[PDB]
Symmetry: C5
Subunit: 97 residues, 5 copies
Amino acid sequence: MKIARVCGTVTSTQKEDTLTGVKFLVLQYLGEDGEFLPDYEVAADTVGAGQDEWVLVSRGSAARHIINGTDKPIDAAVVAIIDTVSRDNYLLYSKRT
Amino acid sequence: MKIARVCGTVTSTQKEDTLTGVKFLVLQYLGEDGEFLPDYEVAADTVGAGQDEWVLVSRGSAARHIINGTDKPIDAAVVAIIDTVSRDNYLLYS
Amino acid sequence: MKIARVCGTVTSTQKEDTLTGVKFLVLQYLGGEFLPDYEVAADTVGAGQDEWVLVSRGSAARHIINGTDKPIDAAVVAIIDTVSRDNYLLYS
Amino acid sequence: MKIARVCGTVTSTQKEDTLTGVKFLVLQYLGEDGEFLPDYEVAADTVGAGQDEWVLVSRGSAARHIINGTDKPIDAAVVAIIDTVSRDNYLLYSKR
Amino acid sequence: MKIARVCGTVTSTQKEDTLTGVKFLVLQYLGEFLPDYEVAADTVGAGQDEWVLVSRGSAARHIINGTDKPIDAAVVAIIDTVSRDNYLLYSK
């Protein structure tokens, strides 16, 4: 999985029937030391991730194993909203509780 | 999924038999700050996307889960036509 | 899928019993020009030297005819007649 | 698979209920010459890897075949803690 | 599939139980070699410096008895020959 931040949304009306009701988040990947990387992923979200929150994103067939994702033609999804990130036992990020 | 713009088409007669009737679109991947990369993809379209339109492209086995995609040897598919893209509360595309 | 041209072949006598009969093509990826990355791929469609092909990668490749339960990562799934960008042809 | 080193953790209390109990490790991928890259991956661990330990990480559907991983939406897993890595007759890593 | 050569080995004792017996080879991808490596399961019995086809993703589990093995890379063939644009790039 990869760490990213929620940076936006994608909207559509003309799409695969299987994607009705699917909320599309734009994600910006985060690199070393929280770096805002020039790289993004449109991902489905069934967790409830807010703008600017840090998330874990899974890509490939894993996306289809989110709740109700089985028949969905999606290759990226939010599977967790990050509460904490740490390196060598020291905190570098925390979420608003 | 990636954001991409429809830029062309691919046709073929000599092909795996399961691909009969599958429309192929040439797609161009969106880079950064509204720019499109010199990277392309060829994807199946069961949504009905056209030239210059923006779309969501899903890759891998996801493609086989489009309408009639079962057991087709395709690793890329248009799954949505995009109406709007916001990033950091700025309406990048509409 | 990606666009490529058939540039060569690969042979092996020491291999998974599952790859029996499988022919191995070498593909050179295209960018309207061609490019330095290679893919080794299966083919049943009859793609020959210099022909333009569409290559599908990952589990898709096992969905070619007789591809079931073959440990193959990539396959030619079509030979290309035309490729149009906007209002012109990069290739026919 | 890729070789990587364990260099941290991620925690989440709001997530897919399938992932309950899932230990998340932050991994750092080996580049060349014994030197690690600034590319990172968050992977599930059922092997019990710890800080600074070298590991083999498998990605994609492979990650769901770890013990108990069947229907988990995970695309990266630690599948082995490394004892040695060779590149010839030399020894890029030894746990010892 | 990717052309690589075998440049080393990885051993482990604490690991997923399904991987008992699995030999791990270090590979370096491809007319000469890149800084990019991969570690892969070997059931064909490849050796140091030999060229090989590596298959990645779910393909790796369609090797002999790989069904429930958490592996995403596998040596599926030892290469005897590689040909490119009417010219021979590799053989022994």
